[PDB]
């Protein structure tokens, strides 16, 4: 028998910080979901997903009315995850 790490290559990305609210427009959808889609469309080509999640957090940096801070949790990504869109 050969051993393997029980937990590896994960990344979780939550819409806000522990104990705090996330926001959703009742007809236009969630703010975190809208931003993640936009940064993915723009950066999947040149950035790894860990870099994209950072860029998403950056867009929330200024607390403007409905403040929220997306957070990356329990990261065991050992490598850069490049999506290579089109391949």
């Amino acid at each position: 028998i050969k051993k393997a790490h029980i937990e590896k290559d994960f990344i979780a990305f939550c819409s806000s910080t522990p104990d705090n609210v996330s926001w959703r427009h009742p007809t236009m959808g969630s703010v975190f979901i809208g931003r993640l889609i936009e940064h993915m469309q723009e950066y999947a080509c040149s950035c790894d997903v860990e870099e994209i999640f950072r860029k998403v957090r950056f867009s929330f940096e200024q607390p403007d009315g409905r403040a929220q801070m997306p957070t990356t949790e329990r990261v065991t990504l050992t490598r850069c995850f490049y999506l290579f869109p089109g391949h």
């Binding site: 705090n20 609210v21 999947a44």
Partner: protein
């Protein structure tokens, strides 16, 4: 909702990103990439998540454009979600896949994700620790050494997330 159209990597741009520090990608014509979307909109004791269809639309359109076959599950209990994740983890398609995305959209608390039956009186919670456990090397050997991206659109309590300054 959103079209989810992505800027494509050129052959030259892809080859420029070359290393033993990147996750490998499988052949486009034969790989079987899967993604799961669990979205709770209608609830027993907590308010309806109006606008959740805009989120499902956008995420589904994006994930397909990224090469994933998308499965959408709606209005489930924490137990239903756990059984769904157990089934997803054992799908034979992960063996001929190089990665996965799990998208959760619901109400939430500090402890975790709300199911359809959640109330202060009778809790219906799917903890993040449970999601990781169901997708780990032991419970999901087909995703071993492959990136597992989890996306959570949920409150993590009812605090405003701010401190006030003069």
């Amino acid at each position: 909702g959103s079209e989810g159209n992505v800027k494509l990597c050129s052959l030259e741009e892809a080859q420029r990103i070359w290393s033993a520090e990147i996750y490998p990608i499988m052949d486009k014509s034969s790989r079987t990439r899967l993604a799961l979307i669990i979205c709770n909109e209608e609830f027993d004791s907590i308010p309806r998540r109006t606008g959740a269809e805009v989120d499902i639309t956008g995420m589904t359109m994006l994930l397909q454009n990224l090469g994933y076959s998308v499965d959408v599950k709606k209005n489930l209990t924490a137990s239903d979600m756990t059984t769904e994740l157990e089934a997803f983890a054992h799908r034979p398609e992960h063996k001929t896949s190089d990665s996965t995305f799990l998208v959760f959209m619901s109400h939430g608390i500090r402890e975790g994700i709300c199911g359809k039956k959640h109330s202060e009186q009778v809790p219906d919670i799917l903890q993040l620790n449970a999601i990781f456990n169901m997708l780990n090397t032991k419970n999901c050997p087909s995703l071993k050494d492959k990136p597992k991206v989890i996306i959570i659109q949920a409150c993590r309590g009812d605090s405003p997330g701010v401190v006030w300054f003069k």
